[PDB]
Design a binder for this molecule. Structure first.
Ligand SMILES: OC[C@H]1O[C@@H](O)[C@H](O)[C@@H](O)[C@@H]1O
Ligand SMILES: OC[C@H]1O[C@@H](O)[C@H](O)[C@@H](O)[C@@H]1O
Ligand SMILES: OC[C@H]1NC[C@H](O)[C@@H](O)[C@@H]1O
Ligand SMILES: OC[C@H]1NC[C@H](O)[C@@H](O)[C@@H]1O
Lengths: 822, 822
């Protein structure tokens, strides 16, 4: 039922068994170098780009899962074991993995020898550091040999897995047994030609021996768990020539009773200017200057400790912007630690690389990285700022955009499709969230190219004009926006009609013509068009702003007139003008996306929570009856049981999975916020709980996946695996639940001209205090909360009552005490 | 060392240990459905296309190599083992694997139970059949449980290994324990949607139980060697929902001493008409009729035995066209069995799918499948006719062509680049060989589209015109052919200048302009331009033929005037117009390709073998001294030790591998042929022996790969791994060495109007007889061969002498007796 427990004071999740339901990972690094690290040391690392600069190899869908990562074989008297458990799977007297913020510790103990490894990526460094502590826990002296192991990737991860006819002949290493700080191995494939970068794997000691060739170290016919070298007790000292390069060092250790030793291993990513690639005039020997420097920065324990403390200080400081103290310690741990930590990861990774996303085809999604901003702008505004410029530079002059860009190059590509008509409006979403947060109006003036074209620069604001005008000029017969390839739901392809197997719905060519419309984009246009009009007003553009609110008006009125089914919002009109998401159809009656997003947009809001005549209220009640489950809200009901050619990808999933009846968690917080907008705090918070890691920890054997982060997808009611998650970690659910909980449930949300304090969470959290730093000042917000249905807040500020729920921004350096009664 | 032996009478290679240096595979099937089967039962199967219809999953670069395939776990009173040895690796009393023609047989014995499995793909079937015979070889009764196992792939092999974020939720199966002939499992992923196909895995008996979920069968934390289910002794009857579908049946047997039992397993690929996909109106249950009909065609051992006998008769028939009886049993087994079998494999596979080619990026290559025709035309000429039509249909109107086509759709693509200028001329090579073989002049009238455009058809001959004109109208400043992206050598990229890492030289954009020319294409053009001339004269195209010979003469003169270095032929002019492959540069002084091919074209051939002044002789002596290793001839010398930006991919390989000083065996037969042209039989035969599998069997530990088929590359003298092969099976070396030995060494080659008999093999083959069927007549050719340098045959035919070396074709039905004196 549980496989570990949170450690709130340490900011760690503690895994107390190797035998979890699935591999459970951490991400190390927050800047430009990243590692996937499972609780069994499986995973890999990459610089900037998981497809293009992957340092170490990892196999998806391996048998068993996650047999492959950073291993340390201990040979004690002929007995070989690994403290990560896998691959050898020797009985351990004690095992524990601690996943922390930017680091993890994995401990195994066997027959009087305890081996603990601290893994992290140091701030400022493109390296993964491991600090090993071997301890004699027996009453007698003890000796052992330790064999380190890492398997290299040949940089291009797609090439590495497919192009052996070339790549088995190109692997190249160097060995440096007597370096300045210890022993090192260089992985230097293709440095001969166009690469200016190599990898290093070294230790802060003169190793007894080494191995660079996988086949020699593992042995023929053997798995990682039977590697010949550790069993033999002595390195072969292999020098790779093609095949499969690895990094491994042997170190002999001797320990008195109770005595320990630290060893420091470093996996690094090094570059040289072209001028300085080589150490020799013949150009055969890599220039090792930067690696000697890197290894010198991690030559001692003290230096590792000092970096782990700077990393802890960096996390303390990131988490100082938004905190809560409440009566619900699960709510608290989510808000203060886990949900913000995940937001940092998604900002960096988008949907690119996890234990489910393979870090090949997906780079940095236009819609996804825009939505990640919403959860990230409060953490490091300046990096959010630059991300906005990078994303907007992949937009086209007509307002549409590349659906994603390649992280190394910042260039758009069509590798997972083009012409998704929801994409343009998300850019407004992210900019609005950024300006509300930081107040940096001058970003609107930043010159930004179209599709990276030298000389095409216009102000960022003009880019938002192109997004807005894209929708206004791409409406169909009902005044709703044309959907194109798909909207937010990638599997709703109304211009597709595909009969050909094995061509991606995402990528396959679309039919010209038709009248296919999205009720979802309409709700999105209403929400974010209003935001754009506001941006325009601030810029003194009264002509532009006026026209804009008119269009918003026309589209709102189109949603009530032509997008309302009777008890919920319509989903779409197909190519031929048929309604999708109507009670008139047998399957796919109600789809969740327009319900939450329409009501978020104020569409169909009546007199209050108990205004039973109001579309918003009918919509949400229907969401509740027809879509709700103990695990969250399923995307549509009922799921499709046969292929519907005119809807594209959606009906191709078996019922209850992904977009065909799955709980697609990213869209539940839309419903959450909808319910707070309508004044049903209690129900809003209920939905929050159903999908939130801290609340699902007690059902770990059912969720299966990491119990400390949101997943993309939980199997829905119509699936035999109801409650089982897939695709953990990399989901917009993280940014969107942070919004929901922080800004609409706890109620604290930056606006243009003040801080909105508008609790709506219902009776299960009767008091809390939020600490929010906003525009240089600190708001202490003490909330006493009846939870009464429909009841909203009154504020007194610094001893004096104020009107409404917006506290105008105090000057930098202030502390403002706001007293809240709901 | 050796790890087995040839069995000529059985036409098998006999592997006597599991512990080979590398997995050794056979190919099953010769029609539309194929299996890669290793001596450990490893590999996978596909229908028509390895990328788009892969039935079963295989992991390239697994640890260990080749742990996944068709396994049969035996649980004998709790002991679990596999007769394939992998994956359980339990100690076997006896092991043997026999690779034969379209079948293999693998036998494993442990603790009084012998388990023999016969694998093949039957004629006219899309299925892999296994016949399993279990024998009690002990002196006491036995009870054992047999668990079969295969792991499905989700059809699209690329999506399977990269698109988990979708595909983990789409896997579906149906289980039929009580079918008409036994138990069956249906793998039907995506049948719900666009696929009209599904796989079956069945046994000819009612199974005790089954399994369809991989995780349940294998167990958490377990590899395939530690599978839980067989260890537990009973199936878990698991029914997959997503994740990893498998096919598995359990069958308990009880055997008295010396008793045996047969079991027939079938892995079938089935299709239904769209109107007939579903058993039920609700469209939920697959229509099983064709799967029931398939299982019924293999419900008995008798039915298997008959099919295997028909497969034998089919091969005996294929091999009845060319054979030799000589004093060299190594030569004979290559000419009679192995090289012809290989030629059928290359005709079918091109270069897409092997244990090195991943069946992903590569489909059927234009140059590749054209050149394969040279060694396949005599086997099944009607299939070569169709193949020529399929190829020519991927050609553009300007005469240039798509570099390869998708096996499933027959439509060309640029996935591995475009604008390889040697491509167009290979079309003529293929048609010339085919017509010489068959005399089917009518093929030149076949209407053939460009780029498959309906309505674009012109006669085949007209395609050849376009090929010929392409080269005429693409010459540089020396009158030598413009190189384009590359010629035959994919890595000689003169229009490239890439400094961006990670980007394929094959697909990356090229510079317009410069003056880069290829001596190889020049030689190629002289050789095949001449055939083109001949075909135009015979179509009655006098002026065209005259014009064609004029062009050939210019290009021949240009080779001698501008493509000559002094002691060898030049390789090329670079973008700047500088010579490539000259003694004036320090690396890449001499390249093999234009040496073999210019001399085959007759360029610089003098008065005889002893004329030291003929450029052909000098060229070939330079190739001997500079390129010769005891493992074959390296591509160029010295190999490049630094990246040469003007040359492309070539210098990106470490010295001695692939195109940078590897023995690229495909170009070795060109030198073999060349040598026979100058009358140096002994040396030509020497070169043939150096790379030929039967002669390298005695160095199996050095070669490492299959000792019965040619490999693409043998590491060169500048490699640390000198003599170790990579990329076995799929190589043009098969067809080119067949051409060399059958036609130039042994000397029996079809021409347009008679059969040329021109032995040039030197004194190691003093006497031999060739039985050649050509144009429905059998030629019995008896050769007394002095092997004396430059000595050339004279003939008598049916007791009467004739002039020169061409025997006019006798009419169908006759036996012609040719007595040959050299
Ligand atoms: O695309 C196929 C080509 O790839 C190159 O990288 C290899 O060196 C060539 O041997 C091969 O012909
Ligand atoms: O290309 C990415 C898209 O792939 C589809 O196969 C999935 O159903 C979507 O969830 C995903 O957004
Ligand atoms: O289709 C829904 C959803 N699939 C998952 C994708 O990452 C996201 O971009 C998309 O909005
Ligand atoms: O580059 C030489 C050679 N490499 C291997 C390819 O399959 C072939 O088409 C090419 O000619």
């Amino acid at each position: 039922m549980r496989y570990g427990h949170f450690d709130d004071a340490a900011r760690e999740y503690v895994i107390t068994t190797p035998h979890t339901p699935y591999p459970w990972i951490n991400y190390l690094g927050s800047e430009q170098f990243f590692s996937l690290l499972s609780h069994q040391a499986g995973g890999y690392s990459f610089y900037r780009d998981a497809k293009m600069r992957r340092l170490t190899r990892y196999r998806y869908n391996n048998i068993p899962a996650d047999a492959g990562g950073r291993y340390l074989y201990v040979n004690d008297g002929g007995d070989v074991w690994t403290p990560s458990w896998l691959p050898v799977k020797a009985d351990l007297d004690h095992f524990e993995a601690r996943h922390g913020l930017g680091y993890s510790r994995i401990t195994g103990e066997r027959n009087g020898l305890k081996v603990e490894t601290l893994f992290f990526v140091p701030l400022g460094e493109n390296a993964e550091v491991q600090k090993v502590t071997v301890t004699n826990t027996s009453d007698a002296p003890k000796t052992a040999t330790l064999f380190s192991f890492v398997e290299f990737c040949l940089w291009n991860a797609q090439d590495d897995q497919t192009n052996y006819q070339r790549n088995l002949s190109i692997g190249e290493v160097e060995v440096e047994q007597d370096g300045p700080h210890g022993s090192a191995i260089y992985h230097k494939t293709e440095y001969r030609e166009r690469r200016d970068h190599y990898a290093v794997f070294g230790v802060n000691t003169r190793a007894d021996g080494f191995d660079t060739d996988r086949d020699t170290f593992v042995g023929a016919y053997n798995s990682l768990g039977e590697a010949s070298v550790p069993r033999a007790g002595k390195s072969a000292d292999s020098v790779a020539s093609g095949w499969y390069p690895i990094g491994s060092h042997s170190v002999a250790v001797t320990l008195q009773p109770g005595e320990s030793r630290d060893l420091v291993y470093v996996l690094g990513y090094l570059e040289n200017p072209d001028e300085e690639k080589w150490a020799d005039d013949a150009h055969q020997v890599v220039n090792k200057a930067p690696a000697h420097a890197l290894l010198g920065r991690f030559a001692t324990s003290e230096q590792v400790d000092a970096a782990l403390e700077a990393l802890n200080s960096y996390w303390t400081n990131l988490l100082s912007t938004y905190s809560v103290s409440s009566t619900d310690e699960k709510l608290d741990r989510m808000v203060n630690i886990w949900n913000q930590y995940q937001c940092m990861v998604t900002f960096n990774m988008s949907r690119s690389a996890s234990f489910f996303e393979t870090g090949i085809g997906r780079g940095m999604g236009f819609r996804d990285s825009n939505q990640d901003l919403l959860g990230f702008v409060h953490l490091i505004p300046e990096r959010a700022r630059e991300r906005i410029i990078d994303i907007a530079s992949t937009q086209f002059a007509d307002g549409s955009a590349y659906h994603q860009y390649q992280p190394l190059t910042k260039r758009g590509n069509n590798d997972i499709g083009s012409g998704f008509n929801d994409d343009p409006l998300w850019l407004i979403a992210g900019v609005a969230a950024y300006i509300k947060e930081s107040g940096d109006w001058g970003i609107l003036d930043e010159p930004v190219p179209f599709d990276n074209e030298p000389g095409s620069e216009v102000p960022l604001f003009e880019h938002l004009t192109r997004s807005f005008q894209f929708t206004v000029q791409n409406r169909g017969p009902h005044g709703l926006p044309l959907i194109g390839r798909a909207d937010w739901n990638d599997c709703l392809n109304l211009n597709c009609f595909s009969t050909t197997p094995g061509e991606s719905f995402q990528t396959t060519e679309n039919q010209a013509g038709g009248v296919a419309e999205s009720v979802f984009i309409a709700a999105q246009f209403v929400l974010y068009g209003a935001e754009y009009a506001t941006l325009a007003e601030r810029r003194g553009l009264a002509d532009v702003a006026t026209e804009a609110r008119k269009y918003v008006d026309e589209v709102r009125a189109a949603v009530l007139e032509h997008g309302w089914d009777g008890q919920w919002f319509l989903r779409a009109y197909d190519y031929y003008g048929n309604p999708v998401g109507t009670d008139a159809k047998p399957e796919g009656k109600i789809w969740i996306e327009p319900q939450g997003f329409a009501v978020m947009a104020g569409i169909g809001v009546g007199e209050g929570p108990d205004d039973a005549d109001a579309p918003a209220v009918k919509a949400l009640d229907s969401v509740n009856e027809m879509l709700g489950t103990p695990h969250g809200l399923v995307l549509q009901y009922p799921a499709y049981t046969t292929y519907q050619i005119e809807l594209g990808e959606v009906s191709t999933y078996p019922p209850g999975y992904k977009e065909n009846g799955g709980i697609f968690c990213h869209n539940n917080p839309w419903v959450i916020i909808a319910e707070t907008v309508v004044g049903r705090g209690a129900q809003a918070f209920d939905y929050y709980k159903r999908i939130t890691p801290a609340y699902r920890e007690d059902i770990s054997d059912t969720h299966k996946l990491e119990p400390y982060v949101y997943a993309q997808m939980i199997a829905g009611k119509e699936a035999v695996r109801a409650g089982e998650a897939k695709n953990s970690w990399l989901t917009g659910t993280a940014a969107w639940n942070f919004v929901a909980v922080s800004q609409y449930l706890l109620g604290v949300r930056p606006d243009y001209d003040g801080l909105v304090v508008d609790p709506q969470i219902g009776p299960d959290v009767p008091s809390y205090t939020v600490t929010r730093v906003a525009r240089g000042a600190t708001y202490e917000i003490t909330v006493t909360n009846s939870g009464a249905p429909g009841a909203r807040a009154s504020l007194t500020v610094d001893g004096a009552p104020v009107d409404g729920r917006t506290v105008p921004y105090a000057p930098a350096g202030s502390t403002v005490r706001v007293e809240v009664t709901v």
